[PDB]
Amino acid sequence: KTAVDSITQKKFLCDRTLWRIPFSSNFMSMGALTDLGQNLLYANSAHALDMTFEVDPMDEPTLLYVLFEVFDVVRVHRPHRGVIETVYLRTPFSAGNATT
Amino acid sequence: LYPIPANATNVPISIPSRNWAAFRGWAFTRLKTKETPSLGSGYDPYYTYS
Amino acid sequence: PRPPVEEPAVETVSPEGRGEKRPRPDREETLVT
């Protein structure tokens, strides 16, 4: 009966996870090769990207770990005894034609 | 790993100009510079954290 | 007791009952094995 005048502080904690924003036209995982990565606007043309993150201020130098999700694929060929040939390809952020 | 200064609020990053075919999405998390070693180096002498 | 099986004899493992991403809970639709 002697309760003070109080205000509500709301927050959330979401540990262990990565804030996924899928590059899909409805934010749904209908496949890994999404419909916007197959879109001819984003397939045959070049586009700049400027992302802007507003974060809580911390009294410590922090980092920002962004996963630019790609297709980091390796195809491995062994044609003869002792021979180990690999072809690497990741798209979009290509290191390039890393055939061995 | 884009560096965020101390008590900094806005973090502008910029991927310059590129074809975005087969792009899947983003996933991001703030880290700490104390808790993240500068990998690629064989030894980080400024990494006093275990 | 046994995973689902097609019969083409040969005896072929059937892919039914496997887990998927669904916008609606999968127990009210199907049986998940």
């Binding site: 996924r20 890994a32 999700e69 | 899947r24 | 004899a9 040969v10 005896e11 072929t12």
Partner: peptide, 29 residues
């Protein structure tokens, strides 16, 4: 057709499925 390499459940080989030969496991899709 490599059906003598399969364990016989009964009198027939317990062959796998065609669609299980690959993989599509990937983080987030």
């Amino acid at each position: 057709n490599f059906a003598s390499l399969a364990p016989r459940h009964g009198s027939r080989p317990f062959m796998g499925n065609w669609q299980d030969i690959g993989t599509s496991n990937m983080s987030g899709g």
